[PDB]
């Protein structure tokens, strides 16, 4: 049945995007650490930053691995109820990963902002863009959580089908907003590196 296989295929693609975004995020973290070791903003605060980074990085990896497991199960089910259930759970997995990545992304904005305080005016214009996309992704996440709740409720007790399709749209929108934020943090870091020494 092509509708559901089409959703499973798109879920694989969203997960792939999440992994590529995790990779970029990780590079931004490393880049921020290199800059901080040179610039040295303010230290216990940076130790807690580092701890938080490590916590969320661990979380994200676990979510990605669980998503990879669920993806494999759904693709098995396609060959084989359980499919709809697995598709909903995969939407939950992807949403948790996006939420955790968004927190990680906000930790890098914190780091970038601490550094740009010492290298000092298009920071304010960079700020406005960060805020705009932060608000957008927050509202997309909020809407995605509500939809997930409705789908899960219906799954237990179609509005289910419609809710699943709309949730695909919600997730992709949020991943797309995250991409824009990543381009913004990449820009901020290059701009900082260009100004040192």
């Amino acid at each position: 049945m092509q509708l559901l296989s089409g959703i499973v295929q798109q879920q694989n693609n969203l997960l792939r995007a999440i992994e590529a975004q995790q990779h970029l995020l990780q590079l931004t973290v490393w880049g921020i650490k290199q800059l901080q070791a040179r610039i040295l903003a303010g230290h216990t605060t940076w130790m807690e930053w580092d701890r938080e980074i490590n916590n969320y990085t661990s979380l994200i990896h676990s979510l990605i691995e669980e998503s990879q497991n669920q993806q494999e199960k759904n693709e098995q089910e396609l060959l084989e109820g359980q499919l709809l259930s697995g598709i909903v759970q995969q939407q939950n997995n992807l949403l948790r990963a996006i939420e955790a990545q968004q927190h990680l992304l906000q930790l890098t904005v914190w780091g970038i902002k601490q550094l740009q305080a010492r290298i000092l005016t298009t920071w304010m214009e960079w700020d406005r863009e960060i805020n705009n996309y932060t608000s957008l992704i927050h509202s997309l996440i909020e809407e995605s959580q509500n939809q997930q709740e409705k789908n899960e409720q219906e799954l237990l007790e179609g509005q289910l089908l419609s809710g699943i399709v709309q949730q695909q749209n919600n997730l992709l929108r949020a991943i797309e907003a995250q991409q824009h934020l990543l381009q913004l943090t990449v820009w901020g870091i290059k701009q900082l590196q260009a100004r040192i020494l």
Partner: antibody
Amino acid sequence: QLVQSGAEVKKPGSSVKVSCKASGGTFNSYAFSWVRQAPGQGLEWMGSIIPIFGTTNYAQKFQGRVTITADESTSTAYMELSSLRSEDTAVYYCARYFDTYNNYGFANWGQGTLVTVSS
Amino acid sequence: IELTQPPSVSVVPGQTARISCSGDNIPYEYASWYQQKPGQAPVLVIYGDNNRPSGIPERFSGSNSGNTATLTISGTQAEDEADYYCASWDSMTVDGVFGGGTKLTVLG
């Protein structure tokens, strides 16, 4: 993936710049370290660059002696080591890490560049 | 971070080899293991928590407990004779670090 420039013979006090041309991935997804090995000895990490930002950090032992650079249009990383001494005699490797988002290990290595420092 | 490895370890063909590396601090996921043969570049054998790259035999596995990582080679072959290095990264500073290396001899 990683092809380095040829062997070098240098005198104490000179400089050497070693190159590493990367082929077959996405440049902006690269992360490189330089790593050296004296003959019969262990590996010694020298420093890193993240080419998409051009950000670097170096082991403290080499602060003020080593520069790591990368060029996107030629897809090449460089290590320049100044004020050479006989103890800098070693094979020098470029190495790429972050092959995937959770691979911090060095997945790809250059063939190595021997640099012999002698009066 | 200072990573301590035994200078040498020896094994009989078919016997299991275990090479320790002590000294890393959390997160241990930054760590990796390398095989190096004479006149060759090092080869990544394990990264993070027992992840094997493509083309690396299943007989190689990584484990960890506290500040001590262990490379295990079950049913070791003569071709497993090599230097093995552990490495990791310091979390705050992203300084790399290698252990001193372990020469593995397969007896025969």
